[PDB]
A paper describes a structure:
Here, we designed a linked recombinant SADS-CoV S2 fusion protein (HR1-HR2) using N-terminal residues 764–842 and C-terminal residues 1025–1061, with a six-amino-acid linker (L6: SGGRGG) between the two regions. The structure was refined to a final resolution of 2.59 Å with Rwork of 23.4% and Rfree of 28.2%. HR1 of SADS-CoV forms a 19-turn α-helix trimer, while these residues first form the random coil tether (residues 1025–1036) and then a second heptad repeat region (HR2) between residues 1037–1050, followed by the other extended conformation residues 1051–1061. HR1s from three HR1-L6-HR2 (SADS-CoV) molecules are arranged around the crystallographic three-fold symmetry axis and also form the central hydrophobic core in an antiparallel manner, resulting in a six-helical bundle structure with dimensions of ~107 Å in length and 30 Å in diameter with a left-handed supercoil. The HR2 helices make five full turns and pack into the central HR1 trimer to form a highly stable six-helix bundle conformation that coordinates the fusogenic events between the virus and host cell membranes. Such a structure is typical for the CoVs fusion core and represents the post-fusion state of the SADS-CoV spike protein. Intriguingly, owing to a lack of 14 aa insertions, SADS-CoV harbors 19 turns in HR1. Consequently, HR2 motif of SADS-CoV has only five turns in the helix region, the first reported exception in α-HCoV genus. A structural comparison between SADS-CoV and SARS-CoV-2 fusion cores revealed a high degree of overall structural similarity with a root mean squared deviation (RMSD) of approximate 0.814 Å for 71 Cα atoms of a piece of HR1 protomer. Only three-pair polar side-chain to side-chain interactions were detected between the helical region of HR2 and HR1 of SADS-CoV.
Virus entry of CoV is mediated by its spike (S) protein, where its S1 domain facilitates attachment to host cells, and its S2 domain is involved in the subsequent fusion between the virus and host membrane. During the fusion process, two heptad repeats, HR1 and HR2, in the S2 domain, assemble into a six-helix membrane fusion structure termed the fusion core. The formation of a six-helix bundle (6-HB) fusion core brings the virus closer to the cell membrane and promotes membrane fusion and infection. In this study, we have determined the fusion core structures of CCoV-HuPn-2018 and SADS-CoV at 2.10 Å and 2.59 Å, respectively, thus further completing the structural profiles of α-HCoVs fusion cores.
Numbering used by the authors:
A (entry chain F), B (entry chain F), C (entry chain F): 1024 to 1059
D (entry chain C), E (entry chain C), F (entry chain C): 767 to 838
Write the structure that this text describes.
Amino acid sequence: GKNLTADMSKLNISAEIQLINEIAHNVSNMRVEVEA
Amino acid sequence: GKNLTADMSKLNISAEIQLINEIAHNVSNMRVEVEA
Amino acid sequence: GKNLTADMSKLNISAEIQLINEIAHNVSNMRVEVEA
Amino acid sequence: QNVLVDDVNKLANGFNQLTASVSKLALTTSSALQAIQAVVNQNAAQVESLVSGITENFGAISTNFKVISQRL
Amino acid sequence: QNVLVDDVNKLANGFNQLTASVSKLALTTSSALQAIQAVVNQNAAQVESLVSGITENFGAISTNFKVISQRL
Amino acid sequence: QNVLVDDVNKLANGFNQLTASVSKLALTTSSALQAIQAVVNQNAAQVESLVSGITENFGAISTNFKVISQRL
Ligand SMILES: [Cl-]
Ligand SMILES: [Cl-]
Ligand SMILES: [Cl-]
């Protein structure tokens, strides 16, 4: 028989998750008020 | 030998999918017309 | 024993990836300047 | 005070452009998410189905060793 | 030159609406991405753990054939 | 009728800010999606490759039982 090996990739999108959270915070702090 | 058990996680992002569809509907209904 | 078969699904979202890249290019080319 | 009227026009069109493409962005993201869910869950189901099959095989193998070890 | 003031009002509200929902869009996308990462990585870990177990079993099976083949 | 000119300025900058970050949002989403596709497909390929290997092993085991059961 054969020597089973797995070698599974692991997903790393922590930066994208965190950068998208920062976008959602920088927007929504972009309200535009007016007048007097 | 060993007692192989799987215990696979299943992905549930139906709410996020559906909430993103509602965003795409609430936008695009945000056209801004003008004049007279 | 049994005849193990895998039948693994493969993910194809190349169109969505590419269409989202085109959106990011069509935005950001939407700067609005003014005056004289 | 003449450019104001043109500037309101420019923002209007740019706003309606932006919303249209934010709309498209959300739908395209939704479509990717749906495909990912379907594939990830199906691949999980297969692995589960696979382990059941592998367990039946190991049981049948274990049975064979026991039958031959005592019938010997 | 009277509609300008109303038009500035309309763009203002539409802009604050758009930003609020772009905000929501980003957060909801972030939330989907986080769930996908957790599930994909856990499913990978299981397969790895599974192959280790399958390898122990094949070793024990290989040992049994050798013990019985020479003790015969 | 003096605030109109300042208000057009405010919307202008806020619009160019919003588009810049909607741009960033799309690119970052694209980048996450690309990584997910690569990982999900590679993990699928491994499982497929793994099952082939497990099937070769079960065949070799089945052959051994048959050789020893008739040579006995
Ligand atoms: Cl699509
Ligand atoms: Cl949520
Ligand atoms: Cl990035």
